[PDB]
Scaffold this active site. Structure first.
Site, PDB file in Angstrom:
ATOM      1  N   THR A  16     -36.112 -39.966   1.378  1.00  0.00           N
ATOM      2  CA  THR A  16     -36.863 -40.116   2.617  1.00  0.00           C
ATOM      3  C   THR A  16     -36.514 -41.393   3.374  1.00  0.00           C
ATOM      4  O   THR A  16     -37.079 -41.625   4.450  1.00  0.00           O
ATOM      5  CB  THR A  16     -38.367 -40.100   2.331  1.00  0.00           C
ATOM      6  OG1 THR A  16     -38.669 -41.056   1.305  1.00  0.00           O
ATOM      7  CG2 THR A  16     -38.817 -38.712   1.892  1.00  0.00           C
ATOM      8  N   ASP A  39     -10.926 -23.194   5.566  1.00  0.00           N
ATOM      9  CA  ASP A  39     -10.329 -24.475   5.927  1.00  0.00           C
ATOM     10  C   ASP A  39      -8.835 -24.479   5.616  1.00  0.00           C
ATOM     11  O   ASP A  39      -8.178 -23.437   5.752  1.00  0.00           O
ATOM     12  CB  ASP A  39     -11.078 -25.592   5.183  1.00  0.00           C
ATOM     13  CG  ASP A  39     -11.095 -26.886   5.940  1.00  0.00           C
ATOM     14  OD1 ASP A  39     -10.042 -27.553   6.000  1.00  0.00           O
ATOM     15  OD2 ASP A  39     -12.174 -27.263   6.460  1.00  0.00           O
ATOM     16  N   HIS A  69      -7.884 -31.844   3.966  1.00  0.00           N
ATOM     17  CA  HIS A  69      -9.171 -31.668   4.638  1.00  0.00           C
ATOM     18  C   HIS A  69     -10.047 -30.655   3.908  1.00  0.00           C
ATOM     19  O   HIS A  69     -11.225 -30.917   3.634  1.00  0.00           O
ATOM     20  CB  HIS A  69      -8.911 -31.259   6.090  1.00  0.00           C
ATOM     21  CG  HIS A  69     -10.132 -31.125   6.943  1.00  0.00           C
ATOM     22  ND1 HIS A  69     -10.798 -29.928   7.101  1.00  0.00           N
ATOM     23  CD2 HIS A  69     -10.761 -32.015   7.747  1.00  0.00           C
ATOM     24  CE1 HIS A  69     -11.801 -30.091   7.945  1.00  0.00           C
ATOM     25  NE2 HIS A  69     -11.800 -31.349   8.353  1.00  0.00           N
ATOM     26  N   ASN A 161     -16.472 -33.010  17.266  1.00  0.00           N
ATOM     27  CA  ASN A 161     -16.270 -34.457  17.203  1.00  0.00           C
ATOM     28  C   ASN A 161     -15.904 -35.076  18.549  1.00  0.00           C
ATOM     29  O   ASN A 161     -15.135 -36.039  18.612  1.00  0.00           O
ATOM     30  CB  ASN A 161     -15.203 -34.834  16.176  1.00  0.00           C
ATOM     31  CG  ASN A 161     -15.506 -34.319  14.790  1.00  0.00           C
ATOM     32  OD1 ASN A 161     -16.653 -34.257  14.363  1.00  0.00           O
ATOM     33  ND2 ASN A 161     -14.458 -33.955  14.066  1.00  0.00           N
ATOM     34  N   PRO A 175     -25.554 -19.190  18.352  1.00  0.00           N
ATOM     35  CA  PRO A 175     -26.938 -19.544  17.985  1.00  0.00           C
ATOM     36  C   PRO A 175     -27.368 -19.116  16.586  1.00  0.00           C
ATOM     37  O   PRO A 175     -28.222 -19.788  15.990  1.00  0.00           O
ATOM     38  CB  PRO A 175     -27.785 -18.863  19.073  1.00  0.00           C
ATOM     39  CG  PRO A 175     -26.829 -18.573  20.189  1.00  0.00           C
ATOM     40  CD  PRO A 175     -25.489 -18.360  19.567  1.00  0.00           C
ATOM     41  N   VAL A 177     -25.889 -19.099  13.629  1.00  0.00           N
ATOM     42  CA  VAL A 177     -25.399 -19.820  12.460  1.00  0.00           C
ATOM     43  C   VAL A 177     -26.044 -21.199  12.469  1.00  0.00           C
ATOM     44  O   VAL A 177     -26.858 -21.502  13.349  1.00  0.00           O
ATOM     45  CB  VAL A 177     -23.863 -19.868  12.434  1.00  0.00           C
ATOM     46  CG1 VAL A 177     -23.303 -18.443  12.424  1.00  0.00           C
ATOM     47  CG2 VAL A 177     -23.323 -20.647  13.621  1.00  0.00           C
ATOM     48  N   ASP A 200     -28.696 -27.503  14.900  1.00  0.00           N
ATOM     49  CA  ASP A 200     -29.817 -27.185  14.030  1.00  0.00           C
ATOM     50  C   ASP A 200     -30.231 -28.348  13.142  1.00  0.00           C
ATOM     51  O   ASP A 200     -31.402 -28.430  12.753  1.00  0.00           O
ATOM     52  CB  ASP A 200     -29.439 -26.014  13.123  1.00  0.00           C
ATOM     53  CG  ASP A 200     -29.367 -24.713  13.875  1.00  0.00           C
ATOM     54  OD1 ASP A 200     -30.438 -24.193  14.254  1.00  0.00           O
ATOM     55  OD2 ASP A 200     -28.237 -24.225  14.102  1.00  0.00           O
ATOM     56  N   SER A 224     -16.991 -32.403  10.269  1.00  0.00           N
ATOM     57  CA  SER A 224     -16.428 -31.656   9.155  1.00  0.00           C
ATOM     58  C   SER A 224     -16.998 -32.106   7.826  1.00  0.00           C
ATOM     59  O   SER A 224     -16.984 -31.332   6.870  1.00  0.00           O
ATOM     60  CB  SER A 224     -14.915 -31.865   9.089  1.00  0.00           C
ATOM     61  OG  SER A 224     -14.253 -31.140  10.103  1.00  0.00           O
ATOM     62  N   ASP A 260     -35.974 -39.680  12.281  1.00  0.00           N
ATOM     63  CA  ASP A 260     -35.463 -40.885  11.639  1.00  0.00           C
ATOM     64  C   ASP A 260     -34.108 -41.339  12.169  1.00  0.00           C
ATOM     65  O   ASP A 260     -33.682 -42.456  11.856  1.00  0.00           O
ATOM     66  CB  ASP A 260     -35.412 -40.694  10.119  1.00  0.00           C
ATOM     67  CG  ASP A 260     -36.798 -40.521   9.516  1.00  0.00           C
ATOM     68  OD1 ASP A 260     -36.995 -39.599   8.698  1.00  0.00           O
ATOM     69  OD2 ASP A 260     -37.709 -41.281   9.898  1.00  0.00           O
TER      70      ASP A 260
END
Length: 279
Positions: A16, A39, A69, A161, A175, A177, A200, A224, A260
């Site tokens: 937290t 990937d 990657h 990015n 929307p 996913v 999300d 990523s 936060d």
């Protein structure tokens, strides 16, 4: 269970508060779940994967990860030291070449592959797909991601990015996913992270230590890197029985640390992935 001196991102998703270094998680650790990493491939022979990783599909002359990657992302999902879900099964689908590039037609094919291939794999606790890739908006790419999700796979995708609104990127803008932005160890939005109403959830994305090719490790940054934190978290929560592939993104948002993060643009969720584990 407690993993001392863990990478900061693992500690963050079980805390937290920022500024701690132990990762706490239920010992079930994603056992019985499966995560597809779509990937550049996965170096399945890396000791960190313990035999739990395997390549199942490539669209190129080899299934080897010649980039790193994909191995890094897979390590954040499920490697023994650097992974969220330390007992999940990892499946590699190589849609990107060793320069990290791939045609949208290939990426779509890999997504449709996972939607079918999950029926050839034993994943009684559920199936996740981690997509640390994207480019400009494509309705066809978004439709493929929506199909994969609809088939019963928790689809986590990188927001991108470009420090821009993710509505203009795919599959980020689909929307249905779970679109993942990146944060840093001081609970700031990562400087490069896309944002917008389509996001999300945020996960750790700046300076993320994980596996690399050649049996190695390194720290790199990107949405990523945040995406496999969320994918691994989904697998972990599905193994616990707390959620399902169709509901995991909503559950992760419902249970996130809220309010936060700093430098969250007005209209973007201020939600940071959190496992809610109480030892």
């Amino acid at each position: 269970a407690a993993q001392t001196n863990a990478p900061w991102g693992l500690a963050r998703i079980s805390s937290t508060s920022p500024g701690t270094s132990t990762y706490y998680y239920d010992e079930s650790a994603g056992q019985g779940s499966c995560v597809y990493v779509i990937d550049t491939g996965i170096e399945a022979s890396h000791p960190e994967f313990e035999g739990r990783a395997q390549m199942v599909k490539t669209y190129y002359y080899s299934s080897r990860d010649g980039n790193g990657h994909g191995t890094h992302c897979a390590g954040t999902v499920g490697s023994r030291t650097y992974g969220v879900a330390k007992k999940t099964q990892l499946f590699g689908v190589k849609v990107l070449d060793d320069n990290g590039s791939g045609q949208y037609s290939t990426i779509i094919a890999g997504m449709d592959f996972v939607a079918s291939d999950k029926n050839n794999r034993n994943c009684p606790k559920g199936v996740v797909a981690s997509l640390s890739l994207g480019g400009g908006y494509s309705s066809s790419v978004n439709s493929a991601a929506a199909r994969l999700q609809s088939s019963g796979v928790m689809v986590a995708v990188a927001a991108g990015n470009n420090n821009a609104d993710a509505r203009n990127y795919s599959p980020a803008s689909e929307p249905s996913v779970c679109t993942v932005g990146a944060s840093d160890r001081y609970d700031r939005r990562s400087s490069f992270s896309n944002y917008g109403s389509v996001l999300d959830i945020f996960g750790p994305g700046t300076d993320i230590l994980s596996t690399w090719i050649g049996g190695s490790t390194r720290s790199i940054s990107g949405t990523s890197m945040a995406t496999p934190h969320v994918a691994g978290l989904a697998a972990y929560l599905m193994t616990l029985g707390k959620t399902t592939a169709a509901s995991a993104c909503r559950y992760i948002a419902d249970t996130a640390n809220k309010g936060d993060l700093s430098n969250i643009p007005f209209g973007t969720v201020n939600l940071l992935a959190y496992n809610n584990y109480q030892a």
